[PDB]
Design a protein around this ligand. Structure first.
Ligand SMILES: COc1cc(/C=C/C(=O)O)ccc1O
Length: 126
């Protein structure tokens, strides 16, 4: 009946960079997924209390969501594109771990992940 602290979006102890790939990840990848009709479940940490999913954070130990990714990108939290790509894949993975195949939420994750994959296919060279 309690949500964990969300993932950090700011860490002054963490070295940070602005690379053209990270810019792509914000301006193209995030923006494309964020605007999608199916983005809303993924635009903020899972509120396991409001969704009455007390076991969500028992099962999901590496939570990730696009709200967090967005803030991280906006805050230049990352060092490289792979960190950010990993966050996206963590988000998708958590969905597929927690839910069943064919669940609406999985279909939404899959639709977003298809766009994710299409966009990162044209990730520019550094
Ligand atoms: C069904 O479980 C999930 C729910 C959500 C979001 C729900 C919402 O914002 O209402 C996100 C990921 C999940 O795996």
């Amino acid at each position: 009946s309690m949500n964990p602290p969300p993932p950090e979006t700011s860490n002054p102890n963490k070295p940070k960079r602005q690379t053209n790939q990270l810019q792509y990840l914000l301006r193209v990848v995030l923006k494309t997924l964020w605007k999608h009709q199916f983005a809303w479940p993924f635009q903020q940490p899972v509120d396991a209390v409001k969704l009455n999913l007390p076991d969500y954070y028992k099962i999901i130990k590496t939570p990730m969501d696009m709200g967090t990714i967005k803030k991280r990108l906006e805050n230049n939290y990352y060092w490289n594109a792979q960190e950010c790509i990993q966050d996206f894949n963590t988000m998708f993975t958590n969905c597929y771990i927690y839910n069943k195949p064919g669940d609406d939420i999985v279909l939404m994750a899959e639709a977003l992940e298809k766009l994710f994959l299409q966009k990162i296919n044209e990730l520019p060279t550094e």
